[PDB]
Design a protein around this nucleic acid. Structure first.
Ligand SMILES: [Mg+2]
Ligand SMILES: [Zn+2]
Ligand SMILES: [Zn+2]
Ligand SMILES: [Zn+2]
Lengths: 109, 387, 97, 113, 76, 62, 174, 57
DNA sequence: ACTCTACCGATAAGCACAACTACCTCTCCT
RNA sequence: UCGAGAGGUA
DNA sequence: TTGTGCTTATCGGTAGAGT
């Protein structure tokens, strides 16, 4: 069982050690069954809220990722939005930039 | 300060160029010993970040730094397109000329990419067509004319010389020279990303994110023979987790374990037994486990009690009816969960050591949607055959 | 043997049938580009109130359940098991040669 | 477009509405009210309709931009050499004679008793 | 127009969840509830009495949307 | 350590019992080894699984 | 440059008070009243005190974040832009050896440097410093007009600080 | 055939590196129309819940 | 009548992933 | 703790 | 160990084009 516990170093997800607080994997089959049932709030909570939850900042003038956030592509911009995405998305973005792929994000708000 | 919150949509894909790489890089030093600097990453033995405040590795993000190259290198991803384009256009005429007419004795040449066969370098190698060479041998021409390779500019870095005359390795500087004089419309048609041809920098992975460090440090200071630099760039690019191979977390498995399959909190897993006394929609929860399991209720955590709903599943989930929302029923028994033997058919399991792991919904909305769609009374009709 | 085949077939079929859903207009449309899969649901009644239900997901789940149940069935020579027969039937584009 | 008069009148409405139902369930800000009380006591006018019409009248018959007319109303110059030395954009021009400008200043002094 | 005029199960569940979330945050209830201590029960009572001021915007696949009301819709 | 640091080994969440014996031994290299044994009497509970001599396997339902 | 320019907002309303449909506009006005009061700052717009005229309101979009509903409302208000080339008066608050204080209301603090006024000498023979060398006495409470310069701002407070120069004519109190 | 670029779902199916490389070389734009793509970025799929919006006014 | 090229259909020849889900211990190093 | 190899559970 | 593509290489192969 688990309520709150240590997270894995690479990805901020619960560890798989029963002696520690551990965690239960929410696999692909469970996600497919939940989609078939149509429960979206449970699926959002299990994949984002109770799972690895992080935040990302994107410049809106130029489709770039800004690290308060500051965009070095342009001058200091007062119009920067924050998106709530799982930490896995940020890890994938970092991996894509490492391999040589630049991602452009066009936020809707 | 504070920033507005917006949704994310319409993700775009592009190959990184020098401009974006330099823009994203923050405090990109060029010191061989400054790979694990205190400006990029918390796990460095300094317990401080230059561009971020003190944190517990949860409030500081991984920053990027890009080293610089003395000599320009063509992008490896566009190597195939450049090789294919160079094969079509003759390299002495810049059209679609001794290399155009067959009566001049110059055999046709073909440009291709060699992979680990000759010098373990993924570059552009020009090879004379052997079929054309054989025809010249029958005419008494045993060797190529001395001025056959006059179209290649003389590289000041003449290292790795003394090679075969039929096959030559084209350096990065010579690639740009051959591209000069070609119409920009033709070049842009083959390669949409014209600005990404020049690769004068390579980013360094954040310390908090990630043999890769050794190769990155080896590229801080480099000598001539830019083909070796290109080979090093190719080698260090393949160490990405998206490439297949042993960490066992790479490629498709990386996707499955990082984005598709995740682990969540407020979950319990225990062996299940049979209890005919319990109702069909009620699940037996031990008093010891329910006391430690905390739920979020608006008045901040309270223990599990009767009336709460938990989503029960038996792995693997073969059909949608494996997910059943059952009301919690506290029982004096411990270290086990009690289930009605009739409910075994939806779970497709028997009481012989099977473990049913449940999920406790924290948000009120998830609980409300749980007993309205995934409840046992909602799933009375089988959706497969209608029975 | 044949313990991974039902899982792989279920995963591929789910990947193919996940985006299918029923629209408000009554048509069966795919999520990608609102592609028309069926103008009307071809069920023989009796209730048409199903609007937000994902028909493709439940069809894939039913076929996966059928495939997993076939794992208990044996194999006969000069013939193939119901699991392999279902795999061959579902895989039509692959057997183009 | 409020220089001195209509900006003061709307503040009077705020004061008139503040005495009624002064108790507020939410929070209040005293900085904004301080900025209004300690800034409106610089220059005041007598009447709203007559002053505005006499200010906008040269804006119609003569060519002055919105920015230039706003800054000259706040400064309220009393001569011809003062305005020619304040605004550098009005230097080296012959679009308007200084005598009509002197008449305009007389009208401004006439409306202010 | 051009709609089933019957509220689906998913819309009903979402409305009930939203109303329960609002009530849990100390929100006044339009309907009168006697001896009710559960926000879900109050939301169910409001839905039965069709006195909840929510409007449903149904997005059609073509891109257009049609605005409806809980009182206009019929529950089953 | 002699400076006050504690490189001690604690018991995890599911670890419990009564200490039975402590064994101290060292090898020829000079490395010291310590062994502590914890014992606990187990009684058949509900979830315990039992098997027969003919393949009949099940858990203790009640 | 006090042009009433309209500016929309996306003020959210907590679910603690959602009732009184016949007088729900009282909750709307109090929601926007606490919206701009919490900010009470600007970078290049200026300042606002009262929502005089409400132009139009939008549909209330709700979100599953602690029971909060947003409302898009567009309205015009009073502001002031410190454009270059304007003669603005001010009241002196105190005096010192450097950085003479000048307050054009409590909305901003204006500082005057040594290289802004004409040739003057400090007078330490009295309590307050005087600059009567050029036949002009300046004290606290007297309104003096000057030429506004480029305005600066901070990161957190974002105060509308600027430089005061008496290089123009008609200097001193009037 | 349908001219609908879905690099993310294709990468999640098999060969993510090659799919991402092809998407970057071609320069396609992923609209996140799929359910899995929305789930990977913290967005509801929209089949059962999320197909409609709730507006008080 | 009598001869050169050139895009094009059928067999070799290497790559390139992928062979199930959720679980739990033990030794080895890293 | 981060990994690898084994042995088992449904 | 393979199943399935997948991409060149490679063998004629004759159709036009020309003389
Ligand atoms: Mg069993
Ligand atoms: Zn930017
Ligand atoms: Zn940092
Ligand atoms: Zn040529």
């Amino acid at each position: 069982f688990r309520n709150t516990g240590p997270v894995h170093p690479l990805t901020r997800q619960p560890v798989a050690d029963r002696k520690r607080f551990g965690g239960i994997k929410f696999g692909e089959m469970e996600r497919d069954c939940l989609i078939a049932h149509g429960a979206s709030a449970n699926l959002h909570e299990r994949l984002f809220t109770l799972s690895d939850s992080s935040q990302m900042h994107i410049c809106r003038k130029c489709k770039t990722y800004a690290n308060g956030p500051y965009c070095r592509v342009c001058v200091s911009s007062d119009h920067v939005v924050r998106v709530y995405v799982p930490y896995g998305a940020k890890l994938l973005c970092q991996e894509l930039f490492s391999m040589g792929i630049t991602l452009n994000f066009d936020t809707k708000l | 300060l504070q920033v507005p919150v917006g949704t994310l949509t319409s993700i775009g894909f592009s190959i990184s160029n020098n401009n974006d790489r330099d823009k994203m890089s923050v405090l990109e030093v060029e010191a061989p010993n400054q790979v694990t600097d205190s400006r990029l990453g918390l796990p460095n033995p300094d317990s401080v970040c230059r561009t971020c405040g003190s944190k517990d590795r949860k409030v500081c993000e991984g920053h990027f730094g890009v080293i610089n190259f003395a000599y320009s290198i063509i992008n490896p991803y566009f190597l195939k397109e450049v090789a294919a384009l160079l094969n079509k256009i003759c390299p002495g005429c810049k059209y679609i000329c001794r290399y155009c007419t067959l009566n001049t004795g110059y055999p046709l040449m073909k440009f291709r990419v060699t992979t680990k066969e000759v010098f373990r370098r993924s570059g552009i190698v020009v090879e004379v067509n052997e079929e054309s060479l054989m025809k010249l041998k029958k005419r008494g021409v045993l060797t190529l004319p001395p001025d056959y390779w006059s179209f290649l500019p003389q590289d000041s870095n003449i290292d790795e010389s003394c090679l075969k005359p039929t096959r030559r390795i084209i350096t990065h500087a010579q690639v740009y020279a051959l591209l000069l004089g070609i119409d920009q419309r033709l070049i842009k048609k083959d390669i949409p990303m014209f600005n990404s041809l020049g690769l004068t920098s390579f980013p360094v992975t954040p310390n908090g994110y990630r043999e890769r460090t050794r190769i990155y440090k080896k590229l801080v200071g480099f000598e001539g023979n830019t083909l070796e630099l290109s080979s090093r760039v190719m080698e260090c690019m393949q160490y990405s987790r998206l490439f297949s191979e042993t960490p066992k977390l790479c490629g498709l498995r990386f996707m499955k374990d990082v984005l598709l399959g995740k682990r969540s909190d407020h979950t319990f897993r225990t062996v299940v037994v049979g209890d005919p006394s319990l109702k069909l929609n009620e699940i037996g929860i031990p008093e010891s486990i329910a006391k430690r399991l905390q739920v979020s209720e608006h008045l901040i955590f309270r223990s599990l009690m009767d009336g709460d709903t938990v989503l029960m599943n038996r792995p693997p989930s073969i059909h949608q009816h494996s997910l059943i929302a059952m009301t919690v029923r506290i029982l004096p028994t411990t270290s086990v969960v009690s289930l009605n033997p009739i409910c075994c058919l939806p779970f497709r399991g028997d009481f012989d050591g099977d473990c049913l792991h449940g999920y406790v919904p924290q948000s009120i909305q998830a609980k409300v949607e749980l007993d309205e769609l995934v409840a046992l009374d909602k799933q009375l009709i089988n959706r497969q055959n209608g029975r | 043997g044949n313990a991974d085949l039902p899982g792989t077939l279920s995963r591929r079929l789910m990947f193919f049938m996940r985006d299918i859903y029923a629209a408000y207009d009554g048509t069966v449309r795919n999520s990608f580009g609102n592609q028309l899969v069926q103008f009307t649901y071809e069920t023989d009644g009796p209730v048409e109130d199903i609007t937000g239900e994902a028909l493709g997901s439940l069809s894939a789940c039913a076929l996966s359940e059928a495939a997993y149940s076939a794992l208990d069935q044996p194999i006969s020579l000069l013939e193939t098991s119901p699991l392999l027969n279902l795999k061959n039937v579902l895989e039509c584009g692959s057997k183009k040669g | 477009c409020m220089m001195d008069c209509e900006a003061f009148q709307i503040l009077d409405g705020i004061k008139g509405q503040l005495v009624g139902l002064s108790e507020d369930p939410s929070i209040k800000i005293p900085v904004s009210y301080d900025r209004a009380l300690a800034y409106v006591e610089s220059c005041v006018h007598y009447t709203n309709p007559q002053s505005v019409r006499k200010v906008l009248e040269p804006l119609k018959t003569y060519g002055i931009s919105d920015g230039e007319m706003c800054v000259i109303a706040n400064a309220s110059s009393e001569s011809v050499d003062e305005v020619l030395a304040f605004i550098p954009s009005l230097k080296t021009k012959k679009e308007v004679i200084n005598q009509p400008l002197q008449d305009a200043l007389e009208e401004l002094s006439k409306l202010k008793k | 127009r051009k709609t089933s005029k019957f509220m689906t199960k998913y819309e009903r569940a979402r409305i009930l969840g939203t109303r329960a979330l609002q009530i849990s945050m100390n929100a006044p209830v339009m309907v009168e509830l006697e001896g009710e201590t559960d926000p879900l029960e109050i939301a169910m009572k409001e839905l039965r009495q069709r006195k909840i001021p929510f409007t449903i915007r149904r997005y059609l696949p073509d891109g257009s949307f049609e605005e409806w009301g809980v009182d206009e819709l019929i529950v089953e | 350590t002699e400076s006050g640091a504690d490189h001690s080994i604690k018991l995890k969440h599911t670890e419990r019992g009564i200490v039975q014996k402590v064994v101290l031994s060292s090898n020829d290299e000079g490395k010291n080894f310590a062994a502590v044994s914890l014992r606990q009497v187990r009684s058949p509970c509900l979830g315990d699984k039992f098997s027969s001599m003919h393949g009949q396997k099940g858990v203790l339902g009640y | 440059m006090f042009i009433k320019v309209k500016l929309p907002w996306d003020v959210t309303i907590p679910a603690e008070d959602m009732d009184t449909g016949l007088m729900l506009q009282r909750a709307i006005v109090i929601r926007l009243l606490e919206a701009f009061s919490k900010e009470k700052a600007t970078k290049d717009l200026g300042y606002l005190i009262t929502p005089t005229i409400l132009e139009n309101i939008g549909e209330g979009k709700i979100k599953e974040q602690t029971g909060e509903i947003q409302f898009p409302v567009v309205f015009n208000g009073i502001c002031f832009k410190m454009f270059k080339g304007e003669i603005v008066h001010g009241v002196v608050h105190k005096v010192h050896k450097t950085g003479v204080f000048l307050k054009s209301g409590p909305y901003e603090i204006i500082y005057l440097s040594h290289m802004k006024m004409p040739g003057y000498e400090f007078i330490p023979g009295e309590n307050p410093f005087f600059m009567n060398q050029y036949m002009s006495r300046i004290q606290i409470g007297a309104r003096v007009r000057f030429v506004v310069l480029d305005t600066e701002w901070r990161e957190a407070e974002k105060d509308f600080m600027a430089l005061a120069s008496i290089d123009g004519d008609n200097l001193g109190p009037f | 055939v349908e001219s609908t670029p879905a690099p993310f779902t294709q990468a999640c199916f098999s060969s993510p590196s090659q799919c991402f490389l092809k998407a970057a070389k071609e320069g396609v734009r992923d609209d996140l129309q799929g359910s899995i793509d929305a789930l990977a970025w913290g967005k509801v799929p929209g089949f059962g819940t999320g197909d409609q919006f709730e507006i008080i006014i």
